[PDB]
């Protein structure tokens, strides 16, 4: 394979990282244009989501993989900003081209963009740095859960999607701890529901329901029998697995497990837990007994879920039918199958008003991508919300900060006598793609559209007013409720400039060609 260096490896790096940004900047914002993306699997995926694009994107040019990475970083913490850091990369990338074309050295270029990004993220700090509690944040959360859920296509008619998030990070993680638990928040979703169907569950909803509703559909508080024991074949790891074809062993077996499962179920009734959750759950033969025992109990359970039933409920663990004791009883506030008005949607909420260690934010919708649309809605909404519920620090978007950032950077670039005086000012240049593509996403001529914000920032010198992000005709950011976590732009910037900077620091490419995986 071959060594590729300098302008060669430069224009190597330049192609996709620039080229990939294009579909994503056409996808930039809600006015960002969708993309039908079809696998070799026969699949079809219509995505204006760059984070989903990058996921959908298997394309070559390892840098084009590194963006699939870089969006996911900002995807969890900041939420939104997955796509912009990508389209900002290609901006400052081509922006970097002509400085080398000028003769500005590859390590001259990157650092001029880099320290100028410091001013940017520093200038970012001037927009709104506020910090409030959850119950106050919900207003700037839902105003942003407008944008987030909405830039995710229909926040519309939902504070149900908005304000369960206000609870989501809140319950799983503190305000001040700022330790990211979207891992503790269970984002659950079900097709056949509605976007108008969205639910917060501080406990765990287990889709498996009572063996029979003829048996009680309400188990009392706790008294959950934690059981890893077969009431159906427990995929047991030891033996050769064969069913019997003869009536002789057909009768000899059917009397066997009617004895044990009943006295198992009675032993469960004996353990004093009137719900039996069984990590190896219920076939019908045990359920007739279970029904005949009149014991409310749970059929097949996912292996880690009965554990997740433990933690999320604070449930004390009864490991196995051999360990049985009446003392340890799993936690459930109320054990019942939940039909939401969507009856095809039936889960058994283990609903913890006492110990809730996994908060299920459960959203619904008509179909797969719909709930997925609503999930990545509910995902990044809360993710942007998580910033704002922790530190509610808001920049108003759509290029209103860009000029604002590009302004200070530009002059301060000239103020720096270093060669990067150009690069730092060249830095402030490529910031303008943010209103630019958005302008053309919103369907406006950016070059004028953006300097509106400039003329605004020339006057305003802050994101408040802006251009249309939603193509609504009121050119605003604050007032258009274009509200972006001030953390995230600092995130988003630092992500772009530094990833590119190493892309700029790496000029030395051993590949069979310009790009590779």
């Amino acid at each position: 394979k071959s060594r590729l260096m300098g302008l060669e490896a430069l224009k190597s790096h330049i192609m996709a990282a620039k080229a990939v940004a294009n579909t994503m900047r056409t996808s930039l914002g809600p006015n960002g244009l969708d993309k039908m993306m079809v696998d070799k699997d026969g699949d079809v995926t219509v995505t204006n989501d760059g984070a989903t694009i990058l996921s959908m994107m298997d394309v070559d040019h390892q840098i084009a993989k590194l963006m699939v990475e870089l969006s996911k970083s900002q995807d969890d913490e900041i939420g939104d900003g997955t796509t912009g850091v990508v389209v900002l990369a290609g901006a400052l990338l081509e922006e970097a081209e002509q400085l080398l074309d000028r003769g500005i050295h590859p390590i001259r270029i990157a650092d001029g963009y880099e320290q100028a990004a410091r001013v940017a993220i520093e200038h970012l700090d001037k927009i709104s740095d506020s910090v409030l509690v959850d119950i106050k944040d919900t207003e700037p959360l839902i105003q942003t859960a407008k944008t987030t859920l909405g830039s995710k296509v229909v926040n519309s008619c939902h504070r149900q999607m908005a304000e369960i998030a206000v609870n989501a990070v809140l319950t799983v993680a503190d305000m001040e701890r700022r330790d990211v638990d979207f891992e503790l928040i269970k984002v659950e979703g079900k097709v056949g529901g509605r976007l108008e169907d969205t639910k917060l569950i501080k406990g765990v909803i287990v889709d498996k329901d009572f063996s029979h509703p003829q048996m009680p559909k309400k188990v009392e508080d706790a008294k959950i029998a934690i059981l890893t024991c077969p009431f159906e074949p427990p995929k047991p790891k030891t033996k050769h697995k064969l069913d019997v074809t003869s009536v002789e062993d057909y009768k000899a077996l059917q009397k066997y497990e009617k004895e044990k499962f009943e006295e198992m179920i009675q032993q469960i009734k004996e353990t004093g837990a009137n719900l039996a959750i069984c990590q190896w759950g219920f076939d019908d033969e045990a359920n007739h007994l279970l029904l005949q025992n009149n014991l409310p109990a749970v059929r097949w359970v996912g292996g880690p879920e009965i554990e997740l039933i433990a933690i999320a409920t604070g449930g004390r663990i009864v490991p196995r039918f051999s360990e049985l004791t009446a003392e340890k009883l799993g936690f459930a506030g109320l054990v019942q199958e939940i039909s939401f008005g969507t009856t095809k949607d039936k889960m058994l909420v283990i609903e913890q008003c006492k110990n809730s260690r996994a908060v299920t934010i459960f959203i619904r919708g008509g179909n797969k991508m719909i709930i997925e649309e609503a999930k990545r809605s509910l995902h990044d909404a809360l993710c942007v919300i998580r910033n704002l519920i922790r530190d509610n620090r808001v920049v108003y978007g759509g290029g209103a900060a860009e000029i604002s950032c590009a302004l200070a950077v530009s002059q301060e670039a000239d103020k720096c006598p270093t060669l990067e005086q150009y690069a730092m000012r060249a830095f402030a240049d490529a910031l303008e793609v943010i209103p630019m593509a958005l302008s053309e996403n919103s369907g406006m001529n950016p070059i004028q559209t953006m300097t509106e914000v400039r003329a605004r920032q020339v006057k305003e010198m802050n994101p408040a007013l802006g251009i249309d992000c939603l193509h609504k005709g009121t050119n605003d950011m604050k007032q258009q409720h274009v509200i972006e976590t001030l953390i995230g732009k600092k995130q988003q910037i630092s992500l772009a400039t530094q990833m590119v900077r190493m892309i700029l620091k790496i000029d030395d490419i051993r590949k069979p060609g310009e790009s590779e995986e």
Partner: protein, 508 residues
């Protein structure tokens, strides 16, 4: 792997739906040239298809752009009805509009809004010329007739449409508040009739009833059961494994005749002479099932028992246990009525009522299917006739009229997006173009004159393009529910606009 850019993503978007949109075009509007489906790839067949949904899946839909309208149009006919042919053409008409705007480089945002903007305004305009023909129930029955009249049109049916008109009318009439799609039961068969659609007493059933067993039954009260056997009973004894030799491969099959005989006794515990085991039996079983006095009548329909579970006050459930679990079906006479050389056991003594079974005897199963969607759509659209007595005038008389204001609007209403909205008010009139020239008329004097003839208020005046003329929609009776007009747009409206704004296609 692959990253596709907009131009192809837009052009392939353009071509496929356009390529499929013109499959049924000459078959759309009134009847122009028909559409022959040649199947050379998967088989060798000469086929005639005016149906998009048919034409859709037959030809390769694997164009991801085609997939959209193939899906969207399919969904639309599956909802409001006869929308596939529409939607497939409509967004195909739409794609050509923005394609210029795209060529003009008009902001993808602009065409999206303006069309969707105008999409409202036209259906809005579609809301006005929508006229209740169903105020009076008899006029509603007449509303049901004309609305079903435009539905059954343009396809290939010889005498069939006449049975379905009244029936799509009657499915509504007796049901009180909705049409009967399920209470109507579809039986598509080849009988002694090259063209028939008629009403089925109970539901007819096919079998050769020979040998000893009496081939008619009187005073039937059916024991409704889904549990039974074929060559092996479902019971404790239903399985035996013995072959030690080559004689046993012969002997193993004889013990199969042991399993049938023990159930023949089991129907006698209930003592019920009319018992449906919905699983089949042969003559040698018919030899055995004729001995006991409790007969197992084989291959009873699920929906036909549902048909009976409706009117008889009985139950349609699964499996079975004892006669009181699933309520006893009852039919006055279960009879075997021979149609041609073959005899048909006929469940009868039960005639219509809360439900209907409909047996279509065509010359082909082909003629049997084209009437179903005709019926199926005329059923649904006459259920649309139920709530909305509105029928807005067919032959695209709405389209031009929908295009009238939007045109007049687009000038005024947007100070920009008239590009889209005019283009909207443009494409609406393509359907009249493809027929009026197929009609022999000059569409140029159709889509606009007759437009400003009906759009300025003679709405009955519309397309009789099977005369090659302007024609009177209420007089021609060519009109269909205002509800059949809106959503076929709304589907097609987004059918286009999706792939419009699709600027990239990633491929695994």
């Amino acid at each position: 792997a692959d990253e596709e850019r907009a131009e192809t993503a837009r052009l392939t978007s353009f071509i496929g739906a356009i390529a499929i949109g013109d499959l049924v075009k000459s078959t759309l509007g009134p009847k122009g040239m028909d559409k022959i489906l040649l199947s050379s790839g998967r088989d060798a067949s000469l086929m005639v298809t005016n149906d998009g949904a048919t034409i859709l899946k037959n030809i390769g839909v694997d164009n991801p752009a085609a997939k959209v309208l193939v899906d969207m149009s399919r969904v639309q006919d599956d909802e409001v009805g006869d929308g596939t042919t529409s939607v497939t053409v409509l967004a195909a008409e739409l794609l050509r509009e923005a394609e210029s705007l795209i060529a003009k480089k008009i902001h993808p945002q602009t065409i999206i809004a303006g069309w969707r903007e105008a999409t409202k305004a036209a259906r809005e305009a579609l809301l006005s010329s929508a006229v209740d023909h169903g105020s009076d129930e008899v006029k509603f029955r007449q509303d049901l007739m004309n609305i079903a009249g435009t539905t059954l049109s343009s396809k290939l049916l010889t005498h069939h449409k006449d049975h379905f008109t009244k029936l799509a009318v009657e499915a509504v009439l007796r049901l009180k508040g909705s049409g009967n799609l399920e209470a109507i039961h579809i039986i598509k068969k080849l009988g002694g009739s090259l063209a028939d659609s008629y009403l089925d007493e109970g539901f007819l059933l096919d079998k050769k009833i020979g040998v000893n067993q009496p081939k008619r039954i009187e005073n039937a009260k059916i024991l409704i059961a889904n549990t039974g056997m074929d060559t092996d009973k479902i019971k404790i004894f239903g399985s035996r494994v013995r072959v030690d030799s080559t004689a046993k491969v012969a002997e193993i099959e004889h013990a199969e005749k042991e399993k049938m005989k023990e159930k023949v006794e089991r129907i006698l515990k209930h003592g019920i002479n009319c018992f449906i085991n919905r699983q089949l039996i042969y003559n040698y079983p018919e030899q055995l099932f004729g001995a006991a006095g409790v007969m197992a009548i084989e291959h009873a329909d699920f929906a036909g028992v549902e048909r009976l579970a409706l009117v008889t006050g009985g139950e349609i459930a699964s499996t079975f246990d004892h006669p009181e679990l699933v309520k006893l079906g009852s039919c006055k006479l279960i009879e075997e009525v021979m149609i041609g050389e073959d005899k048909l056991i006929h469940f009868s003594g039960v005639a219509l009522g809360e439900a209907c079974t409909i047996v279509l005897r065509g010359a082909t199963q082909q003629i049997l299917d084209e009437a179903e969607r005709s019926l199926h759509d005329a059923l649904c659209v006459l259920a649309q006739t139920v709530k909305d007595s509105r029928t807005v005038y067919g032959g695209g008389c709405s389209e031009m009229l929908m295009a009238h204001a939007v045109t007049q609007l687009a000038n005024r209403t947007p100070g920009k997006e008239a590009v889209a909205m005019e283009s909207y008010a443009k494409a609406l009139r393509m359907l009249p173009t493809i027929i009026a020239d197929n009609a022999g008329y000059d569409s140029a004097d159709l889509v606009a004159q007759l437009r400003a003839a009906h759009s300025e208020g003679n709405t009955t005046a519309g397309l009789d393009m099977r005369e090659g003329t302007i024609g009177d929609m209420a007089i021609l009776g060519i009109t269909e529910s205002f509800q059949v007009k809106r959503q076929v747009l709304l589907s097609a409206a987004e059918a286009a606009e999706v792939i419009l704004r699709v600027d990239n296609i990633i491929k695994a």
